[model samples]
Target: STGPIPGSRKVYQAGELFPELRVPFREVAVHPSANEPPVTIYDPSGPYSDPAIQIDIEKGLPRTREALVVARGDVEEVADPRAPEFPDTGRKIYRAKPGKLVTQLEYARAGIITAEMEYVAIRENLRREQDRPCVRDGEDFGASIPDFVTPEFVRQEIARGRAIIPANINHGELEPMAIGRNFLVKINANIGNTVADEVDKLVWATRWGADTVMDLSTGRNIHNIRDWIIRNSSVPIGTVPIYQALEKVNGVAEDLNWEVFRDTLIEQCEQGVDYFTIHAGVRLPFIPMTAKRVTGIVSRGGSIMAKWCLAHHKENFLYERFDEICEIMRAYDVSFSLGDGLRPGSTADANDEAQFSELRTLGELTKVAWKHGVQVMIEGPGHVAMHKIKANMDEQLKHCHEAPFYTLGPLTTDIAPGYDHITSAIGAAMIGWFGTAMLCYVTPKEHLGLPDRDDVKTGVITYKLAAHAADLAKGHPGAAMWDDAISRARFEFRWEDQFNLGLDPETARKFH
Candidate 1:
């Protein structure tokens, strides 16, 4: 992404070969009367903000990961017979050598910080910008992000299972970023369907400041949109393969099984998807616990898997064959976002036995994935209250061994049908400050219907505000610097400076 932020100059941080990191700052030099030094802020709007960068929806962004994977020499292109089945367009397909270590966790454990790791270390800290405060004043909930991130710091976090760098060897067109408690709190936007129309949503979300985007499409053009989003997206693109797997079997949950889901996984993995939300935690034993809840099995993936378990009168296929799943994930370096299949569906059901039981299972699954050196993050709660939110965080950290905890709004209440974006933002901001790594945005059309373009933009901006508030509350390194600058500008009647400092300067100028 290209044009400079108002009243500032855009800067670049070069890595080894190519794909230089773009960092933005407010340079102060106009007046000696109110002189200030340059202050750096986090930039999530990737290539969309840089005019010098070329983004081709047809050809896709530059393939930077192609070189790094080639140097490793542990992978080679293999024919994925499944390719001919989808909207078969030409995109390179490859995976790791048999029994080979290819994931970021494996590299970190071996004390090898790859070029990708270094890129994240520099990108995470904006390359130690001048005048950037080294404030460790944030509430990290036991995470310790450094004043300045070093490559070793990133590797150490990954090695210990506290962080994850989701860079699939096949996702060559990526601008890598990390998710963890010790770093800036990240928010993910879930956008689905339409050709160039949906592509525009990805552009809008990133343009408005979303850290990552997940393609949660339930469309017939699933492959077309998935391929388009993966190729066009600058941030990581995530999906629930079961969505497509279920569609393949005529939307019958019982018709879904290991073989079908496995085929679906292979199809998307080859298309360069960075992560997958495998709903492996919804076990049969825990189903009875949710039978009497106010709202049972709320997660789309969760509910589908739950009914499948009931129909087969057996264990979830994902759990039964989890080791095999991890093997596939490690092969492509696709990080797992272990779905909270039994998460509460209402305020009254918050923190119930079913929720905690599934969490324990997720903890066990976390260890299994780690055993295979597959990077993982545990997804949490649906409609939890403010008082009960911290318990979710504390339990996740204790049981999951500190792997990154990503959560939904845990919406404070269930009554808001048309304004859930507001209802959930409250819980989102609170949980984020408590150390949830990524917040999946809940739109105003959440419980009503599928969101349109306006709902998508509104949902993103709301979550962005919530995440920024958490950043300030946590006191992350250089977290409060922008707020401090903008506050000063506002107090001093510096209208232009205030406009430049706000998250949406275009909107700010019109109102001011």
Candidate 2:
């Protein structure tokens, strides 16, 4: 099961701009009697799906990007004084030269297309040249999705702050992918509250089609566990640095300080975190606005900062130290998923003053991050009704200068405790169509308990379908090819082909 998916083989395509870059996709072959070519789709499973490669968690994934990072000459290898000695892959740590920006935004703005950009460009196109004359369909809502995503187009989107490739200079094993309205809508799976087993969870999520994985682990040995997770992960790995920072202070919100939080940021940046969920938008003034709400503040990071602000009677440290945070993120090329600390907890609190207030602050911080040549994506609401979802996307684009919007499912309704995944997927599809770039998936056990293996698979496949629906609605070129292929197989009564072409072939086979 840890090997390749059934009926598909991992195929690598070299980038036209950067021939050295190998982008991955999965090719599913249909019945020979149908006389059709294989169906190709985006693959985030990384080297795990490639039968030619050996899997070893201890040694970690091959440092495929090391040569590219070294060639940039903006970073240097150094001893990691804070790194854990266990599971050491003998990998050297790298950081930007003092006062030098090594971010993708910096390279893109300088009119230089990075290998990461070209890599994503190749990945996004999905070998569509074979299906030339493919008619583009659906509404994009003012988004400029092209028939094909060229390397230059990827560079332009990154330079314009409209899309981001969250690859840290230290995360050499990452197989870069883009997140923006112009590209495929991405989905993130959260794994935490477990140790070594989290690595298995990480692989399972990506194998099932999670574009990015966020390590929300608040348990002990957070540092050591992250080291293991990052090394093995092929997709970009994100983390809420505040969670670890709070752990450093032993769960006392009042005891948290900028110094401790700042140290945690550096530690994570060194460990190759591709993006950070810094709740810098949770300002001091927004706390009172949530007092009359049905659920008050639901985001753990938001509540932590809110409590810190009230205890200190001062502005949010993250907001006040926004410039410093940008510098650290810029040095490592870590994109910011500016956390929605004040996001609504229920439908009644949707788009309320507190939520919007934090969103506006996130917008302000987005510009600051852009100024520092760092990529950014704004996080959005937690629980919004179907009618209010578009407003969230519109406000994010207008206020955040078109930075990518990564949102948790503002579950359309809060009534379904056990079926929040279904409710939230509905909202996810709607917002994704309305131009939200990334959908943070909610599991069926969302409010009740931790997600077991089955729950993770369900959440990922559910979001995968929602994101695919959005892609079709947005008229992304070649988006419907997968559906068309599956339809053809189904109509022809090619049961095997139909199952293999599904989001979860194993599940489909089991159901049948």
Candidate 3:
């Protein structure tokens, strides 16, 4: 059981396990890094928290979530059924079936706490303790996870459909994490582009700390690129399968349909994509909302949905087939990051009726998906002002219920094109504290073009600043541990460690 916080619920005590009651149970804790008495875990085994342990930086992290999937019987074990002879570094890549089967929040809603959640409780709590002075280790670090973020929050948010947490059964390699308002803020990176070294690009992004990724490829070899990325990535990977849908038939929106989308989902799922950013929200009813805008349907998927909706003059296929989509997703244990197709393309369109209306539909879809046991998180707005960040978070929390809200840099202002990373990081940090879960980073090349290697690193480092700032402000447990290490190195002129500890260690190493 994770212990109690004064104003929060005690979902579990330190050593107890929480179980799920719904479709293929996935337990969650009352609080991760919750505001509770420190649970002194005896570390006689495993690698973390012990100084005598030698760290293995070369081999990288071992798969943590695979065993959990193997332990669940509701999951159907499968082979690498995809038709592609995907490239690998001569390593055996594990793959899972498609669709959502269970998620931490879903299981938490059912009153079960799994050991992973407990571990999160411990991890987050440790972070909180590191953040504040140890009033006896974990007692007053000012951190705790709520017992299944309030029901009103969940129901309404799911009702609105703004965010998702993708943990496909096949992706047992994923470490459990959340992507909504009630949890800590997170960041995602778009790792791919039109290039030969696509999968390597993605793994590099993952190694540097991208919570999620959207693989938006535009040519002949998707199965290969996707399979390779899925196998190597440790964090959740998302896809706007529309790109492939377009490539599959040579970029004609009129030719796309539920069948193609379904097949694409199956392909990515077996490849281990944890989430799918299906832009089913931008239906025919919403085409007018985008027409009058400047950056009309900036999201490629959004653009595709818009094009398809207009061409067919019918409801979007994804919308009509959502339940079926959920069915496919549940097979792989994939979660839904329902894309904000109508999300404001520019400040001129922020909070427009189309945006919120699409959100409302997403909320409606959330319950339907949840009913099928698919984990859901809402994606939010693009451009807004300094004053609008709070409103963005507030509205998502209010209208969408408390479903996790994953948002892009609701860029405080659109004036800075080359420095959007800095401009948006400000808003990103603020909203992060305001309760937006994961932030999709916009690089210096944001409005210009796809980022090069330096652009990727700059975007990653800048967002790390935004994300860390938000975490620190929210009183996340052990949030200060990192700062303290760097701070100590700086103060003592331990130049080596300081460079190594800083966010852009390479830059620091270069500077020194």
Candidate 4:
């Protein structure tokens, strides 16, 4: 899994704004008969795909952002008892200095373009300089994607709350990538709830094209295992802190309190989780609205918050203590993936009052998080019909005010159990085309069982193609180059070239 993909080698392109930054891409070579040059594609697999770099789990990936973070001088390294000590990568936990703003949002607002911004701009451009001006085609649905992304444009998007680079200061190993309606559509893979194999799963998921990996581990070793995953991961690592918080309270949702949840946030933040699923919008009043739904509060974090709110007979502590939560996120530059806790779990509940009510509250919280200079992206629904998908995107943009929208399948139908990946991928593609920034992938075992390795690959590859389809439908700049190359190879009967050009070349070669 650590080796490079067949016929594709990892190559690094330097940034103009920040020459020291080396952004990686996968260069796939075609056969000699075609007389075509290697096609460069976005690589999210990180150092694992590069042959020159030796992989070592214990020492972790190189601290690619360490020097850049230290140069800012806004954060200081300090030990906290809550932080886990593992892998021993010689990195220390960092916190923002008092009265200082350390988030990308803060810098973008101040008109400062960070190294992370420049890095993503180069990554998003995908070396399109050689290609002709993207012949803008297809329906953008009101999205403003530039022909070429610049560091300045990236900064502007962050300042306007239209995009985010979720690089927590502690996650120095991350190769920065942007998530917004204007950038390339991204996909996330959910992995966890197991020990040791979690790190392998993170690498495997990303190798297939996962832009972000969320550690949804709920059992023992939550802290230590995360240390291993984050330290080794070259992509942004995200988590539902409440999962661990509830585990701390021994899975008794009613016993969960703000103190335990707050502590869990800090622990994960310091461990370098690039984003968090804060179900703060799942307010007490909103809890009652879900009672009539076909599937009441299907989200684990949402369900936990609901039970806690009902038991306390008070406002959700996460909602009440949101300002304090934002402050913590701002300090470590952890972006907020505001959870869609009250989202529909069935078509009958799609676009219902309960869902929209939570969306409105998420919008208010988006502004609040921005007020503190913390990056934010709103999460969308669980189960939604294809016809109703566009409404989800429209409502998110209207309510959340241009902040990026991240969604989980919104599974089009409830009838399919074993093949929910295909069902949800349909909804995911439509929503993504409508303007969701990142699509959280649903595996074949989504509602059936824990996804093994093959299921994980199927999920990542399925979503990768879905996201790519959205890019093409939106007419993203140079989005058709890969497709054109593969088609040309296919027409010429260059089987190897065609296989190498695919989203899952290994599987394609095997099927042949």
Candidate 5:
């Protein structure tokens, strides 16, 4: 009942205000017209926004994690339900101080199958149905959702703590998905204004499948906007506290220090950010590495830290206080997405010394993060040629030792500033097949400027195509069926159905 399969997670208890489980699902109905179905936006205005749909936002996401944990029988749960030092006064409702032991590794160590593992197993199986996988049912169920992944693969990765289900112990209505080797790659979207744009619009952006929004909104009303997003976000939320730090100092990089960065992390964790992008590789000695690179430190966090270290001649505060960050992160169950602060910004820079040098450090940090039970994934390159993309995935697997490699498109080429989605999807697909997990999409406005809502849609749909393509190549179950349906719709001139079922139905409809 927890997965997104038929009859699962579609219904809930009446009058229950389960915040995490309650996402704004904009209900769409077929009208008696030949025209295309309209795009209905998911509303986060909570109960008032969708008066017709009875729902609650406070009971928290259904106990999906409990079922997965309990089913195992041997896993132990930590006692504190509320992560430590949680300063949020209104939202911290810990009826029971819960002890827990339900991490991805803990489940595998117990030989217990979890809903997440099962779902992924089924998803992979469906993707690979034609291969006729060796195992039948430990993880796959009638080859549902394309069983490209095997139960043994899931079990092995979980044992190594590589792939994670990310279903928090407190979130019960979660549809378990894996983010690691031997499973479907995942992608997280970046939203929010950089202290200079509109934060409200950014919040709405996350609601529409931005897997996780990094509240890098460093403006006056950032805290308020963060509250709105966190309260309504169904997917895990992430943040780069350092952005707020710089903005607090009027965007001056010189004023940054251990105390300021530490406070920022605490502030975000209290806000219930499900993860954090810690760009700790911007170390003191690494500043010169960027000096010769083409774009010269493109990550805002990386560039700022590079300047700060160059000016002060000291190691990164995040690196020095790494253990502390891990503690704070684990308390809130905030997974770590280790950023490639020195990632390439153009095809000329791909696989260059500067990029991989920082990646090596990220590999080091990955181990450090794992030591404290923090879920982690590595962020990679900005631009690359198509042929070289797989090398990045290959090197990441070798260097990071199988940790989930979250990547920004090795954006095939830098020539197309206005239509990078199509250009990058090529590289994105290859990376996904070569073993990259979770792509951060590049849009039409990628090189030109920050994206609008249309750009976000373009980027999400484009990468969805890439991810689905990889799923098919990985032999995941049903990945091809969805495409086949769309093909049939296309071949049959079923324009409405084709558009309706597309990754971007709204855009697809506009084709005519």
Candidate 6:
């Protein structure tokens, strides 16, 4: 049941998209300045936060873009697209009409600001900018967050390839959000769950402030599992196509082929995957750099691509077919995560030549993706020390030319296997503060086993704090309002108010 946050009221601001454009926030009165307008911050909780709204995971959320999609006149949904030839993809998911430029990048470059951009711009503004002044007091490392994110502002960022709206025209169930250095720091949760519990994690993960959710299901029923999550998730959903590609070959890494991978990409795109984590940077030459490292190629997608490269004695097909892949991505408006396959596996391997070299390649490829009007975000490292974390962020923006940088923990150290979430959260916070747009959350189960629901919740909350901390450091206009409110409530001895202001109200209350 959605209720008010202790001393505040939950308000939903509706946009042109009506119910779908609903932006949720907590409006809290300021102490002694109660008559002034209430303060507001972004809320990641979707429809689940509102008791007035009903959720039907079975039938899936309603399509918010039915009108927008038709207005584009470039996309047509196909009833039965070419099924994945790799493994059994189960259901026949719908796809977009081939060769259509329905991507946000294409539209932005054409000088057209579509509804998605407008949706994200409005969502980012949070209805709190009563001519709010731009606060660039903190180190943005070149980020330019506006006082009010207008439709033109969103379009400029997307046009320059600095920010991205990861909305697949097919994923109409999504409540659009922006990802970029200039905006509030965002965190993502990785969920590898069953057909039944998958939707639950999507709800749980988003409720805890995960900006997006990655369906990293590596084994059976991935097709159906992903289907369930996508249809129900209010946040953008991402996946590693190579993982499914690996599953298609029965976990045999060397058996992965270009045709099979292509089919796998097509399969997921048709199902409305907003973005894909593609490890095209793991070139054959870079494999040797990780050869002597303590942990050689730890990224699952990276390792899989490496194994394929070694087996074929050739370059990665994803790299060779880069342009062609961009064509496919733009057709369906799928954004590219451009995963770091050569990402270090150990602290000893942090920031090595292998890491930087592939990063530069990813940078080069980023420009190519921009050439084709495909939205791209470069994924960064696995493990690094605190001193080296800023370098990773700097190197990414320097080499990648400012496409929104998303990174795995780059876990400050490799020693804490059991508590990697804490160790990684340290690095995640620092990177976000330094200017990373999105932090891919690491669970306590990381470096151990698959994450249970508890681990998923822990991971989401950990990074939620990390992202918030980074936002505060960046002097994000709306970031410090929550902390200031909590501080005031605590000083006033309003225990209930303090608890409600916390990220986890139940935990904060129970601890007292």
Give per-model CA RMSD: 2.8, 1.4, 9.0, 1.6, 7.5, 3.4
Q: Report the C-alpha lDDT of model 1 over 1-512, residue by residue, as the tens digit.
A: 23554555556677653354333322332234568866666666666666677666677777766777878887888865451132325566788988777899999999988777877777777556635557466566566868788888989999999999888887887878889988877889988744666677888887777788898888576876677777877788899999999888888998998888988888888887889998898898998889899988888999898889999998988999999998888889999999998888789999999999989999999999999999999999889989999998899989999889889897998888999999899999999899888999988998889888788778888998898899888877666777888888888888877877677677789986
lDDT tens digits, residue span 19-86, model 6? 44556676655555333356665777677776676776666766666566766678665755751122
Off by over 4 Å in 6: 1-10, 16-20, 28-38, 83-100, 132-136
Models 1 onward score TM values of: 0.93, 0.98, 0.77, 0.97, 0.76, 0.92
Cα lDDT tens digits for candidate 2, 396-501:
8888899999999869999889999999999999999999899999999999999999999999999999999999999988789999999999999999999999
Worst lDDT window (10 residues) for model 2? 80-89
lDDT (C-alpha, whole model) for all candidates = 0.81, 0.90, 0.63, 0.89, 0.61, 0.80
How many times do residue backbones clash in model 4?
Answer: 1
Better of 1 and 4 by lDDT: 4
2 or 6, which is superior by lDDT?
A: 2
> Of models 1 and 3, which has the larger TM-score?
1
lDDT of 3 at 72: 54
In model 3, what is the error at residue 424, expressed in angstroms?
A: 1.4
Writing each residue's lDDT as its tens digit, candidate 4 over 90-118 gives 77778888898799999999999999999
Q: Give the higher-lDDT candidate: 3 or 6.
A: 6
lDDT of 5: 0.61
Q: Which ten residues in a row have the lowest lDDT in candidate 6?
A: 83-92
Better of 4 and 5 by lDDT: 4
Cα displacement (Å) at residue 174, model 3: 2.7
lDDT of 5 by residue, 1-512 (tens): 01121111122211122222322333332334434332232222222223344333343333334443355443344334311121333333211123444455544666765555655554333322345543322221111222345666787776675676554433333344567646555666677662213334443344334444566666666665665555544555667777877766777898988777777776666555666778887777777767777777788888887878778787887898899887666654567778878888878878887888888888888888777766778888778898778788778877886787788776888888798888888888887777776888777887788888777767776777787777667655445555565666677676766665555565556777
The superposed Cα distance between candidate 4 and the true structure at residue 137, in angstroms, equals 1.3
TM-score of 4: 0.97
Which runs in model 1 stand beyond 4 Å of their true positions? Answer: 1-10, 16-33, 80-91, 129-136
